[PDB]
Design a protein around this nucleic acid. Structure first.
Lengths: 163, 163
DNA sequence: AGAAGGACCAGTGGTCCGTA
DNA sequence: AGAAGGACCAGTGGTCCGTA
């Protein structure tokens, strides 16, 4: 079992039997590389080429010895990686704030939604288009909860701001 | 059970308990319309919006009383519809030739591959890009056999034409 | 034989909940 | 209690093969 994550500030190495948030974001980068490898082979074999991280990519990671990668964990933190990709400055500031407050990873994770919803609001509430416009982020399915919040907020927007 | 298809020429109404090929192509158009309707609702509900005909679309067709639509049949003839979309003139000519020869639908269907492979060859063998570049055709997954033939042919091309 | 489609199957997206 | 991930489940892509 991998060591649990804790909230770290940018560049910080986590002390003890813990992993930091930069390590977390690095896992997404490693997954992206595994997708590139799956795509290379699919195209060479004339097979349908995936454009997203899929079960196939996770199996490929495991086969390549990257056991510490697993689907539930990667899907769980995807919106956190999203914020890091889309507004690294805000991501860094949120990390510093939550570290200072001694918040745990679950709480920091929850706080990551709000700024993403705000980014969505600034793009006609099109969260899919937000993900797809960022090269690193475009390979990740939009998480259910994030999509629901963006929709809840757009409705409140059309409602409150129609009176 | 729907009446079986027979090879017809453009505009021809099939006589007796038979359906013609224009009727067949019309079924694809109807499916496209059902996808548009599924997309409208997905987007309004803030759900992930499909970009392809999926099980969801077929279920939607059935619910709307279009029982004569079913997945196996639509998937079976998709490359035939593809040829009609991509090179209607060649499609028409192949239909006329096979009608004249008294060929059955299975044989005409088989003959539809070749011209599609040729179209693929003219686009760097990228059959996915061929499908995606045509607005009507882009919503249909490339059929397995067509993909395999395009790959078999590209290899023969790089092989024969490297000596 | 030629052909339409119910129904199954392997593998997917999605995440719960038994575990440490 | 906070957190990592095995494993399951509903529904998908894909098409075989029992049917007419």
């Amino acid at each position: 079992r991998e060591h649990p994550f804790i909230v770290t500030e940018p560049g910080e190495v986590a002390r003890g039997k813990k992993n930091g948030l930069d390590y977390l974001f690095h896992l997404y980068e490693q997954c992206r590389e595994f997708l590139l490898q799956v795509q290379t082979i699919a195209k060479d074999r004339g097979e349908k080429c995936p454009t997203k991280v899929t079960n196939q990519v996770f199996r490929y990671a495991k086969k390549s010895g990257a056991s510490y990668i697993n689907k539930p964990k990667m899907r769980h933190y995807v919106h956190c990686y999203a914020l890091h990709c889309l507004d690294e400055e805000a991501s860094n500031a949120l990390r510093r704030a939550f570290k200072e407050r001694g918040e745990n990873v679950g709480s920091w994770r929850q706080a990551c939604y709000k700024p993403l919803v705000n980014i969505a609001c600034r793009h006609g509430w099109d969260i899919d288009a937000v993900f797809n416009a960022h090269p690193r982020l475009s390979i990740w399915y939009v998480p259910t909860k994030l999509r629901q919040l963006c929709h809840l907020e757009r409705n409140n927007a059309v409602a409150a701001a129609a009176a």
